[PDB]
């Protein structure tokens, strides 16, 4: 709805910064709605649905396992990791590893499964070899935030994201089972909360993954629909802001608002 894109230019004004947006029909992956879709963005921690759907495509042609243990040492930890730091000891498993970067944001999680995978460039490919020729990741957490002005490492663009969301939750690249997995940990949010989610009508479907990187970067992707399904695909990055978090948080809730209003 056009009285969205409103809500986003104001969001824009807000914050002084770009605002990249887009709403896609997950069923037909037509574009209902957009606003610069094919601008560049960092990613930050949304990358790491795409990673653990590498890791889960591993583990669908057996060449991974999700009861797998990853042992790491104090050497490994990065600044934000609620759940590694806790399991330094006895390791943990890749289903747990693809758990913690995805429920709680767990940076050495990631860090980790991307080792496991081969390093950004091996993820970078993963996501070339289905069609994403724009999305790439270069370094590792948690230099992927700098968010450097005009800097293509570690970017994506709204309209790529939300095109490669749909396919790794409705194509037949992952089998079923691994798909439902993701979803459910998309499902399973702790951390995005004063988001979309805060404007979300009671008994709609959401599965998401929010971002935040240093420049004032703020994004989120995500799955959305009534009466307990996803209807479709929305994806929010801004960068630029000088604007507090709480204030970056707001105007996301306020285009959330607005898109669940002319639903």
Known sequence: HPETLVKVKDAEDQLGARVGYIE?????????????????????????????????????????????????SQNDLVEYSPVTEKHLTDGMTVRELCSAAITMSDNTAANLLLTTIGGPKELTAFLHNMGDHVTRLDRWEPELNEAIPNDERDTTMPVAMATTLRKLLTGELLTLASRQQLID????????????????????????????????????????????????????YTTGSQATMDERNRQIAEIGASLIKHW
């Open 24 to 72: 896609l029909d997950l069923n037909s992956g037509k574009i209902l709605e957009s606003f610069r879709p094919e601008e560049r963005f960092p990613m930050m921690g949304t990358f790491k649905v795409l990673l653990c759907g590498a890791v889960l495509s591993r583990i669908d042609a057996g060449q991974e396992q999700l009861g797998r243990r990853i042992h790491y």
């Open 185 to 236: 940990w998309m499902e399973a949010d702790k951390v995005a909360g004063p988001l979309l989610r805060s404007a979300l009508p009671a008994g709609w479907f959401i599965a998401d993954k929010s971002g935040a990187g240093e420049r004032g970067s703020r994004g989120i992707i995500a799955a959305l629909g009534p009466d307990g399904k996803p209807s479709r695909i929305v994806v929010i």
